Design an enzyme around this catalytic site. Structure first.
Site, short mmCIF file in Angstrom:
data_model
loop_
_atom_site.label_atom_id
_atom_site.label_comp_id
_atom_site.label_asym_id
_atom_site.label_seq_id
_atom_site.Cartn_x
_atom_site.Cartn_y
_atom_site.Cartn_z
N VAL A 188 -1.60 -3.24 -4.34
CA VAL A 188 -1.51 -4.53 -4.75
C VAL A 188 -1.85 -5.59 -3.58
CG1 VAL A 188 -0.73 -4.25 -7.08
CG2 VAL A 188 0.57 -4.72 -5.15
N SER A 248 0.80 -1.35 -0.09
CA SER A 248 -0.02 0.01 0.12
C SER A 248 0.84 1.30 0.05
CB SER A 248 -0.90 0.16 1.34
OG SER A 248 -1.27 -1.07 1.71
N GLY A 263 -7.54 -4.74 14.65
CA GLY A 263 -6.06 -4.75 15.35
C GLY A 263 -4.88 -4.39 14.49
N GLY A 264 -5.01 -3.81 13.36
CA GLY A 264 -3.72 -3.33 12.58
C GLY A 264 -2.87 -2.60 13.13
N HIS A 296 -1.82 7.33 -4.80
CA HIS A 296 -2.06 6.23 -4.09
C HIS A 296 -1.96 4.83 -4.82
CE1 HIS A 296 -5.25 2.94 -2.86
NE2 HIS A 296 -4.18 2.88 -1.69
#
Ligand SMILES: O=C(O)c1cc2cc(F)ccc2[nH]1
Ligand SMILES: O=C(O)c1cc2cc(F)ccc2[nH]1
EC number: 1.3.3.3
Lengths: 302, 304
Positions: A111, A94, A260-261, A108
């Protein structure tokens, strides 16, 4: 059991990241990406490369993440109920690039690959991603070139591929409460698995390479465009709109933070400085108003 | 109904005056800039008055709004917490404010008082009050946090022994950023779905809450506004205002529901700071007064 197909994908994503960073470093010539490798409780991790305060790139992040997990998180069981308790692998790159110069667009790209391991059934999987362009002081020729790259890279995969994913990009990157697009579009896709796995993968490779071919030239061309501090103010108000999209609407940003990232890895998307004013509009008739009056509503470049 | 309609109107009148009063007090402290009013009219029923202040001596961006909206059937994203009253005629009114001071040593603050009423045929109406107030400091002082809370504890007292504990606790649970494991401010009051008491009692409470806001906040502004400050301090303030934006755009329900159910964007988003900053892995330097906000003030929670 796709373990080797998945490794091939992993190997590519890691290389794409190196390739985008090197290319962007080459454009800046002052600052380099600093890397932050991280890990999570029984869930793989990622390698977040960030660039701050360069000659050209003021804030820039190109992340790799690879997430393992036992059972899909709580938010995904609303969208993906049928495989809620499954062992899953999610992996992707990202990036969001916020140039110093207002005349270089924000951009931006993404993939990614989701693979869910099933009890008895062959595994369920899909790719996703795209790229898009968020100009401040747009340039017709740049928008056209951007989209042309997208259409050209799509050509080998089917005649309708660009149309579908270009349109999807227009529908997705839209602020409905403001009736306003975020940028001038590009490609967007998700749940990509109608083609055999190898054709989809080749497609995401083309999207990865496609980003650098679409964006880098626009950065080379406009980075040295002279800008006033008034144009920086406009740019900062426009970045307010960007923060809104990412924080209010973006599904991945939302799901990244719910489930929770790693906050700081997810929120590389936010701009360095942003402004908000009550009823803020650019003075109609100026290059500042033209972005929203013409550039954001054209939706037909190629 | 008749009694409810008559009561609903006493609530409106309170709200209209609450706004003038808050604006007056806030103008009194600034000395320089004054609120500009923007009246608007919903296509469907009702409208409101949004009053904003910009580039003041003390208040860099200030928003004190009034709304009175009413319609046939609720909006689409109200068939989820209130499906049984989605076809009803409704009335929602309230005053909502966010103040962002120029000086970092003056805290941002927020307050809200509202009433929703859903008239039902033959059955009694459903209704509730909601809101509260809270303090979002950048360079917090101990005495100000204690005072702010004592003013809340004091206005609650007559309403019951456990009222402050509930709505102060609720404030901490609500205004909290879970993904950053981080409180928004030093707290205050928050309450929703308030219909546990007879209407008149709930109403008097929100009046107390509304008065409470000026009593709690205006002295703090008066006390801190002339504190000297550096560009370095303003810079920390703007990074902190990234967290404030975050909460309002990612978490706040009122913002969520407003923006997704056809509310008036610029009015809903007066809450947003004039300038914000984000940086990847940005944290204040440890050992500094900047760091003390998150290390101490924001995790303290016990003020009175
Ligand atoms: O839908 C998702 O899960 C997702 C969307 C997305 C967008 C990005 F830019 C990066 C990761 C993502 N994950
Ligand atoms: O829950 C709501 O409807 C609501 C929440 C809220 C918060 C504010 F600050 C202002 C208006 C609101 N309306």
């Amino acid at each position: 059991h796709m373990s080797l197909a998945v490794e091939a994908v992993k190997d590519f994503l890691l290389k794409l990241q190196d390739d985008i960073c090197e290319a962007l470093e080459a454009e800046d010539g002052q600052a380099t990406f600093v890397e932050d490798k991280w890990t999570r409780e029984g869930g793989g991790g990622g390698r977040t490369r960030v660039m701050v305060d360069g000659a050209v790139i003021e804030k820039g992040g190109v992340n790799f993440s690879h997430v393992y997990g036992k059972g899909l998180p709580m938010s995904s069981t609303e969208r993906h109920p049928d495989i809620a308790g499954c062992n899953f692998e999610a992996m992707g790159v990202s990036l969001v690039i916020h140039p110093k110069n207002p005349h270089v667009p924000t951009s931006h790209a993404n993939v990614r690959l989701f693979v869910a391991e099933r009890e008895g059934k062959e595994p369920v999987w899909w790719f996703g991603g795209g790229f898009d362009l968020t100009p401040y002081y747009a340039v017709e020729e740049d928008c056209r070139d951007f989209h042309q790259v997208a259409q050209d890279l799509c050509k080998p995969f089917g005649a309708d591929v660009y149309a579908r994913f270009k349109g999807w990009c227009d529908e997705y990157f839209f602020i409905p409460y403001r009736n306003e697009a975020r940028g001038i579009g590009g490609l967007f896709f998700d749940d990509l698995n109608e083609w055999p796995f190898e054709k989809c993968f080749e497609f995401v490779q083309a999207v990865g390479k496609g980003y650098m071919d679409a964006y880098i030239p626009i950065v080379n061309r406009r980075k040295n465009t002279p800008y006033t501090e008034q144009q920086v103010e406009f740019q900062e108000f426009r970045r307010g709109r960007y923060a809104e999209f990412n924080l209010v609407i973006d599904r991945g940003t939302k799901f990244g933070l719910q489930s929770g990232g790693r906050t700081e890895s997810i929120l590389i998307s936010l701009p360095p400085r942003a402004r908000w004013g009550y009823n803020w509009q650019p003075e109609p008739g100026t290059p500042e108003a033209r972005l929203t009056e013409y550039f954001l509503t054209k939706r037909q470049w190629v």
